[PDB]
Amino acid sequence: VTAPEPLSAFHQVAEFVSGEAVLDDWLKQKGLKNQALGAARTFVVCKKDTKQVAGFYSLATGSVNHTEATGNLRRNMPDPIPVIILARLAVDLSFHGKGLGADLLHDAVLRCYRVAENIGVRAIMVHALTEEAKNFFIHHGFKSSQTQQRTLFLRLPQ
Amino acid sequence: GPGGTMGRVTAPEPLSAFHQVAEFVSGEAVLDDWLKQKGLKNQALGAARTFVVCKKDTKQVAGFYSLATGSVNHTEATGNLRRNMPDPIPVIILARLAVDLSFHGKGLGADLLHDAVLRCYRVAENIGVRAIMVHALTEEAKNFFIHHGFKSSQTQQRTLFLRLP
Numbered sequence: 001v002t003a004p005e006p007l008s009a010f011h012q013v014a015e016f017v018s019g020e021a022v023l024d025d026w027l028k029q030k031g032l033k034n035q036a037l038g039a040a041r042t043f044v045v046c047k048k049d050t051k052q053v054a055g056f057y058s059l060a061t062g063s064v065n066h067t068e069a070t071g072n073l074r075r076n077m078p079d080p081i082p083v084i085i086l087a088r089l090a091v092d093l094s095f096h097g098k099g100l101g102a103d104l105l106h107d108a109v110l111r112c113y114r115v116a117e118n119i120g121v122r123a124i125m126v127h128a129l130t131e132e133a134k135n136f137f138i139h140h141g142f143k144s145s146q147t148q149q150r151t152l153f154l155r156l157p158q
Numbered sequence: 159g160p161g162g163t164m165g166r167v168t169a170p171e172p173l174s175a176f177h178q179v180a181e182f183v184s185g186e187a188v189l190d191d192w193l194k195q196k197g198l199k200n201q202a203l204g205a206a207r208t209f210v211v212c213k214k215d216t217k218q219v220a221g222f223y224s225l226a227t228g229s230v231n232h233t234e235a236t237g238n239l240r241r242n243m244p245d246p247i248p249v250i251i252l253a254r255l256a257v258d259l260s261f262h263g264k265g266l267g268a269d270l271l272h273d274a275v276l277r278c279y280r281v282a283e284n285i286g287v288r289a290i291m292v293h294a295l296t297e298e299a300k301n302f303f304i305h306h307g308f309k310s311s312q313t314q315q316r317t318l319f320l321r322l323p
């Protein structure tokens with residue numbers, strides 16, 4: 001695949017299938033529209049020598065109240081806690097099991113660290129859609145909320 | 159205007175341990191004390207990023223502002239801010255803004271706000287952001303933001319927004 005780049009009208013998305021239709025349909029129907037609105041910024045990777053999207057993720061600003069956080073995350077912090085929402089992350093079924101999911105997450109993390117140089121950010125927050133998704137994030141260092149087991153956080157040490 | 163001094167200040171730069179803040183006074187003690195007690199600590203925690211301007215040829219702070227990520231529910235927004243948007247709406251919070259009493263009335267409050275706005279537009283290239291949000295501490299502060307293009311929430315006059323796209 002190609003290096004991560006911003007979603008554009010040059011990207012072919014209509015055939016993308018990840019196994020989660022809510023994510024597939026968001027990419028195809030709302031991805032580019034929501035970029036113009038300031039609702040989310042989407043980054044894609046493409047099959048080599050094509051503009052066919054092989055995987056993507058989306059980032060938006062956000063916050064979390066102390067009750068949905070963890071004991072360590074809320075320590076000595078204001079309420080609510082400033083976060084970046086990793087709103088969506090998916091790889092096409094044809095590319096599963098090749099480390100592209102991990103690679104996309106790593107790119108997202110680095111981009112959040114860069115954003116955090118100019119704006120206050122405590123953590124990356126994700127809402128896991130399934131138990132399998134939650135376990136993927138746990139494997140990569142995310143920690144669950146105490147009240148919602150599918151809300152997870154990755155503290156950005158600074 | 160001339161304000162209280164005709165000395166200059168430096169360009170905005172990140173708060174650091176090299177900055178003197180202990181003598182800063184803005185007319186609002188809550189802001190003065192946040193800067194002195196929490197400014198640098200909160201930077202390391204990821205609670206807020208603070209940018210300062212200093213008296214020329216010193217490291218003495220003459221003004222500052224602070225930025226953090228945040229969001230707002232549709233009920234607390236405006237119709238134009240929320241139309242076709244997810245709920246809640248992604249924003250950047252202008253958490254703190256203050257100038258030392260000695261430099262009031264010189265356009266430094268406007269200059270700091272302008273630098274804050276440009277910094278938000280740069281951030282927005284990498285992350286979804288709909289608007290800058292501010293909670294005005296006083297009536298005087300609210301009117302200052304209105305003069306520079308911010309719009310009040312319909313329910314709360316002291317919560318104001320500046321749309322970016």
Ligand SMILES: CC(=O)SCCNC(=O)CCNC(=O)[C@H](O)C(C)(C)COP(=O)(O)OP(=O)(O)OC[C@H]1O[C@@H](n2cnc3c(N)ncnc32)[C@H](O)[C@@H]1OP(=O)(O)O
Pocket residue numbers: 018019020023086087088089090091092095096097098099100101102103126127128129130132133135136139
């Ligand atoms: C993002 C949200 O908002 S929540 C929804 C999450 N997204 C989805 O569920 C959409 C459908 N699923 C997918 O798109 C993919 O399965 C992804 C993106 C979750 C993972 O990508 P994949 O290609 O399957 O995994 P990839 O090959 O990158 O695996 C990377 C590492 O994670 C591990 N891993 C992958 N899936 C899981 C899992 N469910 N549980 C634990 N570990 C996992 C792999 O074993 C590998 O580990 P290693 O480096 O120690 O060998």
Ligand SMILES: CC(=O)SCCNC(=O)CCNC(=O)[C@H](O)C(C)(C)COP(=O)(O)OP(=O)(O)OC[C@H]1O[C@@H](n2cnc3c(N)ncnc32)[C@H](O)[C@@H]1OP(=O)(O)O
Pocket residue numbers: 159184185186189252253254255256257258261262263264265266267268269292293294295296298299301302305
């Ligand atoms: C950010 C928050 O969360 S709210 C808290 C805001 N901060 C504070 O209250 C701390 C105490 N006050 C201050 O530090 C300062 O008064 C500031 C930073 C708010 C403003 O800075 P000042 O030095 O007073 O104003 P500055 O000289 O930059 O004024 C710039 C312009 O705005 C105008 N202006 C200033 N105050 C007001 C006001 N209250 N109402 C309308 N217009 C105003 C000025 O006349 C000038 O207009 P122009 O550019 O058309 O000539």
